């Protein structure tokens, strides 16, 4: 996996190598630096694309979520009413049956 410290250390190694090759002959260092900057801009574009994909995922996640807290509250209140009606039904059953006996 990618790691910022790994990238920084490898960049430092690339700087040291380009320093050595420039001390040898400078034009090779110029070319190496230009190539370094070009894939740097490429990876920057890739990182931006990935961030856009992440933003897409989270935006659509919110869109699909869209509330339902009132839904859960409705669940709670409705099941409460259900158990209330159940207990009332059993109570009236018992009362009327006992009166009948």
């Amino acid at each position: 996996g990618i790691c910022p410290i790994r990238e920084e250390l490898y960049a430092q190694t690339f700087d040291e190598l380009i320093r050595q090759v420039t001390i040898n002959c400078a034009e090779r260092g110029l070319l190496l630096l230009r190539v370094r900057d070009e894939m740097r801009m490429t990876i920057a574009a890739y990182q931006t694309l990935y961030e856009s994909a992440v933003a897409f995922g989270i935006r659509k996640a919110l869109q699909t979520e869209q509330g339902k807290s009132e839904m859960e509250s409705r669940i709670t209140q409705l099941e409460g009413d259900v158990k209330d009606l159940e207990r009332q039904v059993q109570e009236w059953k018992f009362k009327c049956e006992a009166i009948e006996k």
Partner: protein, 370 residues
């Protein structure tokens, strides 16, 4: 090839396996922006998480997902997981197996739903979850003994024998470092100051983190504080102001030691530890006395281990010796425990394969989690 991360009520951490510190740790906060007109800002996102939420808290409405070690929502929780995986870590969730912490004694429904969310929306290859307390104990190398997991939000006194926690012996208490922040704010108000906003709360928690004191006898501490003014120590402000601090420094853990000043109707930390060890059978009580650890963000106060030692000796039979430890880095001990547990060859046996979820429902998996 493994990841480990926390479920902390605040200041959640994350990092790989086999390391001395988590890669990234940030406040566990999610929030949405309110509906307004002209966006005075650049690089806006959908819903900022963690450090971004802290930086732009003035233009956000936020909801904490985990309360007292238990997560209330689930959408916010998976948002945090997404943020951790794809912003702070830059890691594929489908690729690596993941180990996750777990508050002691959580409902089976909560555990099972959490696992199914880990596995369906993320499609993780093999995910496992363990209690925070066991990892915290294993961080100090000890395999048995008592653990005072006094984290943010919740406190748990949990003993362990055979290397695994004791269910019936676990005690719970809702005392919190956030409660301590409220106590510090109240104290600073009757000293006389202005602290009402969330930025002021941040400043207060910074103050308490920088400065606190745990001592033996609050009576003589207060006597010394009212007599001499040498311990009346100074502290800066973000703007050019200088605020000086007194008895509140000793009061910071006094509410921990006696919940009556906050009116929690509970008992002290030493009281809870003694009650837990009494719930424990009398056999391994000496070993539990020998093995006392303080894991948690609130267990970083200076000179707290000796005070706990004195209290437990006073409330304990004098016939056996005690031993309370104080690791240099107790906050992250959960992360170290998770990392060391993950970096074990035999531990790979106890992973939860994707095929197991495919062939059976997560009930037998909740059974297998041991």
């Amino acid at each position: 090839s493994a990841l480990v991360c926390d479920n902390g009520s605040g200041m959640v951490k994350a990092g790989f396996a086999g390391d001395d510190a988590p890669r990234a740790v940030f406040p566990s906060i999610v929030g949405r922006p309110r509906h307004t007109g002209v966006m005075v800002g650049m690089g806006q996102k959908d819903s900022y998480v963690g450090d971004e939420a802290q930086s732009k808290r003035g233009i956000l409405t936020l909801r904490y997902p985990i309360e007292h070690g238990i997560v209330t929502n689930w959408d916010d929780m998976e948002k945090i997981w997404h943020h951790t995986f794809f912003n702070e870590l830059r890691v594929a969730p489908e690729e690596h197996p993941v180990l996750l912490t777990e508050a002691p004694l959580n409902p089976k429904a909560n555990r099972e739903k959490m696992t199914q969310i880990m596995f369906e929306t993320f499609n993780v290859p093999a995910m496992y979850v363990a209690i925070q307390a066991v990892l915290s104990l294993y961080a100090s190398g000890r395999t048995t003994g008592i653990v005072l997991d006094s984290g943010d939000g919740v406190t748990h006194t949990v003993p362990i024998y055979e290397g695994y926690a004791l269910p019936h012996a676990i005690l719970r208490l809702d005392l919190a470092g956030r409660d301590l922040t409220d106590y510090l704010m109240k104290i600073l108000m009757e000293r006389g100051y202005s602290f009402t906003t969330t930025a002021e709360r941040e400043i207060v928690r910074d103050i308490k983190e920088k400065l606190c004191y745990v001592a033996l006898d609050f009576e003589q501490e207060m006597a010394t504080a009212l007599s001499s003014s040498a311990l009346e120590k100074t502290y800066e402000l973000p703007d050019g102001q200088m605020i000086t601090i007194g008895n509140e420094r000793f009061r910071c853990p006094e509410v921990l030691f006696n919940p009556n000043m906050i009116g929690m109707e509970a008992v002290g930390i030493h009281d809870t530890t003694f009650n837990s060890i009494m719930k424990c059978d009398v056999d391994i009580r000496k070993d539990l006395y020998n093995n006392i650890v303080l894991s948690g963000g609130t267990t970083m106060f200076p000179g707290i281990a000796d005070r706990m030692s004195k209290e437990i000796t006073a409330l304990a039979p004098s016939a056996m010796k005690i031993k309370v430890v104080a690791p240099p880095e107790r906050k992250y001990s959960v992360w170290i425990g998770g990392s060391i547990l993950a970096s074990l060859s035999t531990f790979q046996q106890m992973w939860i394969a994707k095929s197991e979820y495919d062939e059976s429902g997560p009930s037998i998996v909740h059974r297998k989690c041991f």
